[model samples]
Target: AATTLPDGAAAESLVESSEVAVIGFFKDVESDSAKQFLQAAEAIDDIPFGITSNSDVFSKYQLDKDGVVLFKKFDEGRNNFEGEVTKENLLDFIKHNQLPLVIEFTEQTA
Candidate 1:
C-alpha cells in the first residue's frame, strides 16, 4: 500500500530519507491517474511509495497536475513522469530510472 503524505514537509522527509522514493501528486484518489499510481506502487517493492493531495507539494515538486515523480539522490534528484500513465509505462519508467546512469571505473579497468 502507498503511504498518504500529508504535506510538503512529509513529502520532503520521504524524499530525503530514501535514496529513491516514488511519490504521486494526484487530485482525486479515485481517478485513473491515481489508480495507475497505486497499481504501480504495488508492482514495485524495493522503493518507497507515497501519495499527496496537497497542492503545495505539487508546486514544490514543479508539478502543475496529477503525476508520479521519482525523487532520488542522483542526477537532478527528481524525475518527472514522461510516459502515459499505463501500468506498463509506469513500470518501465521506474525500472529505467531506478538506478544511477553511470557506473564507476574499476581498478581492473583503470
Candidate 2:
C-alpha cells in the first residue's frame, strides 16, 4: 500500500529519502480519479509512493492542480505527466526514466 502524507513535512521527507517517489496531488480525496490513482499507486512496489489531500502541501510544491509527480534522485527535477492516469501509463513513466535492469537468460524445465 501507499503512504498517506497528512502534511507537507512528511511529503518532503519521503521525497528526499526515496530514490524515486510517485506522489499524487489532489484537492479531493473522494474523487473517482483520486481513488483510482491511490489504488494504482498501491500496486507499485518498486518505488516509494505517497498521496496527500493537503492544499498547503500542493502550494508548497507549486503544483497547480491534481496530477501525479515523480521525484527521482540525481535528476534534481520532478516529472509531471500531462496525459492520462492509469497503472500502465504510470508504470511506463517510471520505467522510461529509470535505469535499465540487467536480467540473465535461463533455460529450465517446469
Candidate 3:
C-alpha cells in the first residue's frame, strides 16, 4: 500500500516541537571573525540546516528540511578575499550590528 504524509504537518511539527539545525562553513579559518562568529553560534543548539562546501547540496537539503530554509556553505577554495567565517566572528559582528538571525540549525556530525 502507498503511504501518504500530511501536508504542512511535518514542517509545522518541526518548528513547534524541535530546535533547528544549521551549519556554516567559512573559506578561511584564519579570519579574526571566524572565532567570534562560531562563539555566537554556540548559544544555539540543534542545527536544522547543514553546512558544507557544496552550496547546492546544502541548499537542497535545507529547503527540504523545512521551508525556505537555506544553508550557506562558502567555497573557500575559490574565495581569496575573506577567509573562513566562524561562529565567533559572526557573533561579534551580530552583537555589534545587533542583527537578528532569521533561521537556525545545528551542526551535522561526521
Query: By lDDT, who's the top model here?
Result: 1
Q: How close to the true structure is residue 18 of candidate 1, measured as C-alpha lDDT?
A: 84
TM for every model, in the order presented, reads: 0.82, 0.77, 0.28
Candidate 1 residue spans exceeding 4 A from truth: 101-110
Residue 101 Cα positional deviation in candidate 1, in Å, after optimal superposition: 4.5
lDDT of 3 by residue, 5-109 (tens): 123333333333333323334333245443444455556444342222333432433433211122223322111113345554443432332234446675567
What C-alpha lDDT values do all the predictions have? 0.80, 0.75, 0.34
At residue 98, give the lDDT of candidate 1.
71
Q: Per-residue lDDT for 1-110 in model 1, tens only? A: 58988888888899787888878888788878778777878987778888988898888867767777777787777787865788788888887777755576655854
Query: Which ten contiguous residues of candidate 3 have the minimum total lDDT?
Result: 72-81
- Number of clashes in every candidate structure? 0, 0, 38
- Per-candidate RMSD vs. true structure? 4.6, 5.8, 15.3
Q: Write the per-residue lDDT of candidate 2 for residues 40-102, one digit (tens) a residue.
A: 776768677888888878998788787777777756457777687776776677776556455
Supply the global lDDT for candidate 2.
0.75
Maximum-TM-score candidate:
1
Winner by TM-score between candidate 3 and candidate 1: 1
Clashing pairs for predicted structure model 1, backbone only = none
Lowest summed lDDT over 10 consecutive residues: which window, candidate 1? Answer: 101-110
